[PDB]
Amino acid sequence: RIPPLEKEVYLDIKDGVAYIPPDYLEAQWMMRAKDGTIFQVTSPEEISYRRQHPVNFARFGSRFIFYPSIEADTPYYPDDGSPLIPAENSVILSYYADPPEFHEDTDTSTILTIAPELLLYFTLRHACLFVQDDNGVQKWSALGKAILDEMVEQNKKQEYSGSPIAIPNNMTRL
Amino acid sequence: RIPPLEKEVYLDIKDGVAYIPPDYLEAQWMMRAKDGTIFQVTSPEEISYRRQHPVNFARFGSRFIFYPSIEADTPYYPDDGSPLIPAENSVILSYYADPPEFHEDTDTSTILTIAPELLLYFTLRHACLFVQDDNGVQK
Amino acid sequence: KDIQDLRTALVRGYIDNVNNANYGRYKALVGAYDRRSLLDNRPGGVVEMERQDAIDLFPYHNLPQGIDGLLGMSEELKETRTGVTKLGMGINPDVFKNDN
Amino acid sequence: KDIQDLRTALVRGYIDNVNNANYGRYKALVGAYDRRSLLDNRPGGVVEMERQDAIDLFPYHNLPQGIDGLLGMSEELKETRTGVTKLGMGINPDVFKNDN
Amino acid sequence: VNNVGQFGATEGSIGAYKQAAEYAADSKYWALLAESKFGTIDDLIAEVERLYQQGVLMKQDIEDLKQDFKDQDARLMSLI
Amino acid sequence: SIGAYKQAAEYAADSKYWALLAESKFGTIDDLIAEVERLYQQGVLMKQDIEDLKQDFKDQDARLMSLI
Amino acid sequence: IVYNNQAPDAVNNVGQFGATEGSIGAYKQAAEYAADSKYWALLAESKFGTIDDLIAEVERLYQQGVLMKQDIEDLKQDFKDQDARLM
Numbered sequence: 001r002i003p004p005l006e007k008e009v010y011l012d013i014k015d016g017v018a019y020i021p022p023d024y025l026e027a028q029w030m031m032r033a034k035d036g037t038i039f040q041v042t043s044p045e046e047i048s049y050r051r052q053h054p055v056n057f058a059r060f061g062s063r064f065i066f067y068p069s070i071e072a073d074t075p076y077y078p079d080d081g082s083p084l085i086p087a088e089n090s091v092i093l094s095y096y097a098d099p100p101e102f103h104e105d106t107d108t109s110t111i112l113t114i115a116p117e118l119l120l121y122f123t124l125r126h127a128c129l130f131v132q133d134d135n136g137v138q139k140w141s142a143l144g145k146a147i148l149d150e151m152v153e154q155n156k157k158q159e160y161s162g163s164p165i166a167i168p169n170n171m172t173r174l
Numbered sequence: 175r176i177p178p179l180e181k182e183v184y185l186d187i188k189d190g191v192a193y194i195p196p197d198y199l200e201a202q203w204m205m206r207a208k209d210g211t212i213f214q215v216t217s218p219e220e221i222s223y224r225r226q227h228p229v230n231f232a233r234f235g236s237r238f239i240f241y242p243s244i245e246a247d248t249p250y251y252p253d254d255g256s257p258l259i260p261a262e263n264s265v266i267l268s269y270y271a272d273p274p275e276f277h278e279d280t281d282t283s284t285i286l287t288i289a290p291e292l293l294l295y296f297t298l299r300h301a302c303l304f305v306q307d308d309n310g311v312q313k
Numbered sequence: 314k315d316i317q318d319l320r321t322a323l324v325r326g327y328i329d330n331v332n333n334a335n336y337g338r339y340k341a342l343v344g345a346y347d348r349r350s351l352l353d354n355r356p357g358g359v360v361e362m363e364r365q366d367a368i369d370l371f372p373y374h375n376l377p378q379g380i381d382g383l384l385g386m387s388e389e390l391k392e393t394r395t396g397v398t399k400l401g402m403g404i405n406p407d408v409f410k411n412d413n
Numbered sequence: 414k415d416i417q418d419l420r421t422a423l424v425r426g427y428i429d430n431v432n433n434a435n436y437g438r439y440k441a442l443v444g445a446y447d448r449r450s451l452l453d454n455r456p457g458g459v460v461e462m463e464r465q466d467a468i469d470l471f472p473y474h475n476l477p478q479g480i481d482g483l484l485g486m487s488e489e490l491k492e493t494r495t496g497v498t499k500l501g502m503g504i505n506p507d508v509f510k511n512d513n
Numbered sequence: 514v515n516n517v518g519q520f521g522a523t524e525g526s527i528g529a530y531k532q533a534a535e536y537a538a539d540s541k542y543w544a545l546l547a548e549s550k551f552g553t554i555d556d557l558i559a560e561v562e563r564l565y566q567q568g569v570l571m572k573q574d575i576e577d578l579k580q581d582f583k584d585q586d587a588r589l590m591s592l593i
Numbered sequence: 594s595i596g597a598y599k600q601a602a603e604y605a606a607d608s609k610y611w612a613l614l615a616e617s618k619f620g621t622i623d624d625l626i627a628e629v630e631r632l633y634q635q636g637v638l639m640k641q642d643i644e645d646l647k648q649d650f651k652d653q654d655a656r657l658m659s660l661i
Numbered sequence: 662i663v664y665n666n667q668a669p670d671a672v673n674n675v676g677q678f679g680a681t682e683g684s685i686g687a688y689k690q691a692a693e694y695a696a697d698s699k700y701w702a703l704l705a706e707s708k709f710g711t712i713d714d715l716i717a718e719v720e721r722l723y724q725q726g727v728l729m730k731q732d733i734e735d736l737k738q739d740f741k742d743q744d745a746r747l748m
Contacts, residue, residue, distance in 0.1 A: 002677045003235065003236070003677040003678055004677040004678065004681065006235055007598075008235060008597035008598030008599065009597055010597055029218050029234070031218070031222070031595075032595070033594045033595040033596055033597070034594045034595060035222075035225055035226070035595075036218065036221065036222035036225050036595070037222055037225075037226070038218050038219050038222045040219075042352055043348065043349050043352045043353075045349060045352060045353045046352050046353070080610075081606070081610065082606075082607060082610030082611075083607050083610070084599070084603070086594070086596050086597070088594065090594075090596075090597075092595070092596070092597040094234070094235055108681075108682040108683055109681065109682070109683065110673075110677075110681035110682070110683070112682065113672045113673065113674050113681050113682045114673065114674055114675055114676075114677075114681075115675075117300065136306070139303070139308065143303070154199070154200075154675075154677075155677065157175070157200055158199070158200050158201075159233065160215065161200045161201045161202070161215070162201050162202075162203075162204060162213065162214060162215030162231065163203065163204075163212060163213065163214035163215050164214060165214075165215070165216065166214065166216075168216070168220045168223070169329060169333060170220070170223055171329070171332055171333075172227075173227070174418050174421075174422050176519045177519040177520050177523070178519045178520065178521065178522045178523055178524060179523060179524045180523055181523060181526055181662075181663070182662030182663055183529070183662060183663045183664070183665060184662070184663060184664050185665075186535070186664075186665075188538075190595070191534070193531060193532040193534060193535050194532060194678050194679070195526070195529065195530075195531070195532070195665050195679070196526075196527055196528055196530055196532065196669075196672075196673055196676070196678065196679030196680050197526030197527040197528060197529070197673070197676065197679075198526075198676060198678055198679070199675070199676050235598050236532055236598055236678050236679070237598065248664045248665065248666065249664065249666060250539045250542055250543070250699075251531065251535070251536055251539040251666060251692065251695050251696070251699075252539070252543075252695060252696040252699040252700075253664075253666040256664060256666060258664065266662060271524075271525075271526030271527065272526060272527045272673055272674065272675045272676045273524040273525070273526070273527075274524070274525065274527060274671065275674050283524055284521070284522040284524055287514050287515065287516075287522075288515065288516060288517055288518075289517070324483075324486075327479055327482075327483060328419075328483065330477075330479055331423070331426070331477050331479030331480055331483060332422075332426070334477040334479065335426040335429075335430065335477060335480070337430070337433070337473075337474035339472070347443075354433070354436060354438075355436075356436045356437065356438070357436070357437065357438050357439055358438060358439075359438050359439070359440045359441070359471055360441060360443055361440040361441060361442065362442065362443035363442065363443060364442075365440070365442055365466055365469065368440065368471070368472065369472055370472050370473075370474050370475075375478070376477075376478050376479050381482075384486075399489070399492075399493040403512070405512055405513060407513070527671050527672070527673055527674070527676070527680075528667060528668075528669060528670045528671050528680075529663060529664070529665045529666065529667040530665060530667055530668055530669040530670065530680075530688065530692075531665050531666075532678075532679060533601045533604040533605065533687055533688055533691045534598070534599075534604055536604065536608055536688070536691035536692055536694075536695045537604040537605075537607045537608045537691060537695075539695045539698075539699075540607070540608035540611045540691070540694055540695040540698045541607070541608075541611060543611065543695065543698035543699045543701065543702040544611030544612075544614065544615065544698050544701075544702070546702045547614070547615050547618070547698070547701050547702035547705045548614050548615075548618070550702075550705050550706065550709050551614070551618035551622070551705065551709075554709045554712070554713060555618065555621060555622075555625075557713075558625045558629070558712060559625070561717065562625060562628055562629060562632070565632060565720050565721065565724065566628075566632060568632075568720075568724060569632055569635050569636055569639070569724075572635075572636070572639055572724065572728075573635075573639060575728075575731065576639055576643060579643055579646060579647075579731075582735075583646070583650070586650070586738070586742070587653075589742070590653050590656075590657055593657055593660065600684075600687075601684045601687030601688060601691070602684075602686075602687045604687065604691055605686075605687045605690045605691050605694070608690070608691045608694035608695055608698070609690070609694045611694065611695075611697075611698040611701075612694060612697050612698055612701065615698065615701030615702070615705070616701070618705075619701065619704070619705070619708070622705070622708045622709065622712070623708070625712065626708060626711075626712055626716075629712065629716040629717070629720065630716065632716070632720060633716050633719055633720055636719075636720055636723065636724060637719075637723070640723055640724075640727045643727075643731075644727065644730065647730070647731075647734035647738075650734070650738060651734065651737065651738055651741075654737075654738050654741050654742055655741075657742060657745065657746075658741060658742075658745040661745040661746060661748050
């Protein structure tokens, strides 16, 4: 999980719901194009209550729910064809996406530009599986894992990097 | 992470969206040239509150957000010069940047001026990987 | 003026403490919760699957001994650099003219 | 106005604490319970099969020391920025005319 | 060219180039500036142009005025 | 408002969709340049010509004045 | 100390924001189109800068001055001729 495979996207809320993208793996922040107003997540066992008696959304199979029963509209798109006049009422989501399998020679991905040796060792792994030179397996695997952890740490030392955090004293009026 | 690869740089905010440079890896301090003043970092979940009801900022994908609608500025892209005399309201960034991959024999990098044996050993590593001499690898 | 500033800093520092503490956040290890269950708060059930140390009250600070005592001193210092006292008897013309 | 806001925040913060705590949720490890038995609450039986540490009272927060003391201060501050006191004697025309 | 000092250099970044969205915004900036200019000054030019076009219309009108007036007062001096 | 982060290839098309307005409006600009140029030329010519005209005209007028 | 005004040249070979081998064309084409738009806006101030200041000013300025001259000349000529012939 890292940025380069992240994605911005608008949704198409019809009524407090929306269907999940095929390409979705894992979610990070969602909110509105305007004002921010970050959503947070909860379970049905709570949201259903909040219906009986901020924002809350949850996961029902292939569907997203939202309590306050929202409406967003995906952009107006095309016509002359210069921009995507985004819609007011739009909420935007950030989610990690399943990258495409190459299925082509000249094809490429951010990875190779970045960290190919990774792919190299990790596939050599299953190769040395095809034919039983295990010790090589162990070596390849260890190295792949080491590389990978280097990466995630590159990211961790990023995601909070700027200055001392400081826990907010968020207190509502009164 | 160390100094020699660090960078000074000015930013163009536009009340938020201020975008992250390609070359970016990790950010140390960040401030204004005006009067000296340090930002600090936080999450969306807080800056958003600051909206509804010091300067903070956060990381929205490839974007930097700042709670107050700041307006530091850069000249627009086609540019023409660069002196700029830093627009009063300029903020400057200190961040570690991805160095360039070598692409030439007479290329160079500080590392070799200072600490080449490092590169030597570490690449010998993957070499002794190419061809199976693992004890050498460990060493 | 001094006393109003000081007591305002103290009560502001006391109120915030009480409020943050009232929040009662529960800290928890990552792979255990059974989020579904925890979020339900109907009298009884949480399945702290695994561990058993997976959920513990967050470590809020105590209040300070000093808030208490200084809030103390200020009260009396008002009540000696001025003649006011929330419990004491007031003057009359007579005693203004003869304290005996 | 201030005092009514403040005491409303405190009692609201006290009531919620007491209610959440009254729920008395029991936390429990995943593979043990004998769910069938636990749900029965007729005087005696639970088969905490296995373990013995499988069920433990959920860690509710304590109340805060400050709720207590500040609920305290406000009471008196009403009773000094106004002449009202829940136990004290009232005035009469006579004492209005002669406190002696 | 120092042994260990980390403060004697800064290996330049990959590139000091912005993320595409800023390039799009800059295109839109130049575009909108130019567009405003066009509309407003085109209205001005056209009307003002048809205007001083009728301007030199009346100009050569008084031009033929002084033509027949010369003509006129040249005949006047011939009389004298 | 706050928009999403489209993939780069889209920002490219957005950037491209600025150049055409510019192109067309430049053509009208050029046509009108040629116009005000023809106008200015005509203007200068007429001006100088009729100016010399009035010059020699008042010359003959003062001649008639001396004759009287 | 610096600005990020330069043009997109390379791709991140480390760093999980920005350019990849499958996106560099987008950056470069965006830069080209932005510079082309500027070319237009600047040439426009020019045509427009030029057009306006230049021709508009030479036209109006001298037409007005020359037509005032016309009034003056005509008046003078007529008056002089008449009065003198009367003499």
